[PDB]
């Protein structure tokens, strides 16, 4: 029936829900392409559903918050990986080799004092 995961990627939270069907995608009450229109990268969110091929099996009701769409996209790749193994832990095989089940540890590094950016030291002349 209902299946859930969570998406977190660089300040992006993704609440994913897997209800079996033809592969619907509602992102904040919107179509996938609707909420991601003009987004080149915003196609791989279902690739975990292309790792294990229940693409036309589960209808995806999902919400997302925080960060750009791209970060929102990665959280989607996370949430999709979650309910799958929750649905079928056998899916962990063909996901762990695919790395979908690991969260992106990358985060916007803290900006330091003195440094313009996290590592952008001002140009100095001796």
């Amino acid at each position: 029936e209902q299946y859930y995961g969570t998406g977190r990627r660089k300040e992006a939270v993704a609440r994913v829900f897997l209800r079996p069907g033809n592969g619907k995608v509602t992102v904040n009450g919107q179509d996938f392409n609707e909420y991601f229109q003009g987004l080149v990268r915003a196609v791989a969110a279902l690739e975990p559903l292309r790792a294990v091929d229940a693409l036309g099996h589960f209808d995806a009701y999902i919400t997302v918050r925080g960060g750009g769409k791209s970060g929102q996209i990665d959280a989607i790749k996370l949430g999709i990986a979650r309910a799958l193994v929750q649905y079928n832990p056998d899916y962990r095989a063909k996901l762990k080799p695919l790395g979908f089940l690991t969260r992106d540890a990358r985060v916007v590094e803290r900006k330091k004092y003195g440094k313009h950016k996290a590592r952008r030291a001002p140009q100095y002349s001796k």
């Binding site: 003009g38 987004l39 080149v40 990268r41 196609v43 791989a44």
Partner: protein
């Protein structure tokens, strides 16, 4: 880069062609993280070459890269009062990136106003073994091979 060799980044294969190398060429296209912009500009030139000489663009792509993948180059070496430029091989890691950087630069210099066409003409002439990017590869190894007398100084 003194302790380890700082192994490469495993790029993510693209959505359209599932390639990392395509993703690689995008990165040389990408400016200011504007991968959405650069992504179309490649995929647009995909359509373009798919129109002019309608084939597999990727077939056009790698064929273009093979025509510009360098294999021998010089390296500066100021041994004594003369700086040497030793003819050197190239790793496939650096073969592509040099070739990748070469094509994009030549694509940065064609006259057609939108970049997607400059890429379009560039990859075409690239697979055609023509254009300054191909010339860039030609000139180097020629320049490289022209100084084979410094071969044994290779380090």
């Amino acid at each position: 880069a003194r302790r380890r060799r700082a192994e490469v980044r495993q790029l993510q294969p693209d959505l359209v062609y599932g390639d990392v190398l395509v993703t690689a060429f995008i990165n040389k296209i990408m400016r200011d993280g504007k991968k959405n912009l650069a992504a179309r500009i490649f995929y647009d030139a995909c359509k373009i070459i798919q129109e002019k000489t309608g084939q597999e663009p990727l077939k056009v792509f790698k064929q273009a890269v093979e025509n510009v993948k360098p294999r021998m180059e010089v390296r500066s070496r100021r041994v004594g009062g003369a700086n040497y430029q030793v003819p050197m091989e190239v790793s496939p890691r650096r073969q592509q990136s040099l070739a990748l950087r070469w094509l994009v630069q030549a694509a940065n210099q064609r006259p057609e106003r939108r970049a997607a066409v400059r890429i379009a003409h560039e990859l075409m002439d690239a697979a055609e073994g023509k254009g300054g990017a191909v010339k860039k590869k030609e000139d180097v190894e020629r320049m490289a091979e022209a100084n084979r007398a410094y071969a044994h100084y290779r380090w």
